[PDB]
Amino acid sequence: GEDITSKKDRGVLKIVKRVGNGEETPMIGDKVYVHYKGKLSNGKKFDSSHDRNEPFVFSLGKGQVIKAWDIGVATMKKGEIAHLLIKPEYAYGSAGSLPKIPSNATLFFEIELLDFKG
Numbered sequence: 149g150e151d152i153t154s155k156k157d158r159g160v161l162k163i164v165k166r167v168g169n170g171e172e173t174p175m176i177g178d179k180v181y182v183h184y185k186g187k188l189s190n191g192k193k194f195d196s197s198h199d200r201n202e203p204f205v206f207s208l209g210k211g212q213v214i215k216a217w218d219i220g221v222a223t224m225k226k227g228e229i230a231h232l233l234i235k236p237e238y239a240y241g242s243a244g245s246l247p248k249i250p251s252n253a254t255l256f257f258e259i260e261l262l263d264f265k266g
């Protein structure tokens with residue numbers, strides 16, 4: 149995957165899994181609508197927006213979600229599906245989030261950017 153971090157620390161690696169139809173990337177503060185699939189890189193735990201058939205909605209760059217999402221979704225076009233490989237620094241770090249996330253877990257997400265508004 150491509151390193152999309154400012155630090156170039158390989159903390160968020162991006163693979164485009166479907167090229168988007170839109171020209172626009174969302175701006176900081178935009179309300180973004182996504183579908184997603186998330187797991188621990190060793191696949192012990194799984195979560196999807198599809199489990200609830202409900203798009204996941206958040207304000208881009210607010211720190212409402214893990215750093216990897218604010219960084220990753222900021223690079224995406226409407227209709228784009230991205231795979232993100234996320235090192236602990238950009239997820240739950242050395243603290244983790246037990247019981248769901250252990251310390252220094254690598255996460256994997258598929259994110260589909262549906263739409264966004266200013």
Ligand SMILES: COc1ccc(CC[C@H]2OC(=O)[C@@H]3CCCCN3C(=O)[C@@H](C3CCCCC3)c3cc(OC)c(c(OC)c3)OCCCOc3cccc2c3)cc1OC
Nearest residue numbers: 186187188193194195211212213214215217239240245248
């Ligand atoms: C700035 O840094 C942070 C910001 C927010 C948080 C809180 C967790 C936050 O979840 C997330 O950001 C990511 C990406 C969005 C979708 C859910 N997220 C998860 O990691 C899942 C995770 C579940 C295990 C398998 C891997 C994926 C994931 C899913 C969960 O439920 C389905 C979950 C959860 O808690 C850790 C994690 O528990 C219930 C909480 C739900 O709802 C939300 C709602 C908004 C945000 C989240 C979860 C931690 C941060 O750093 C450690």
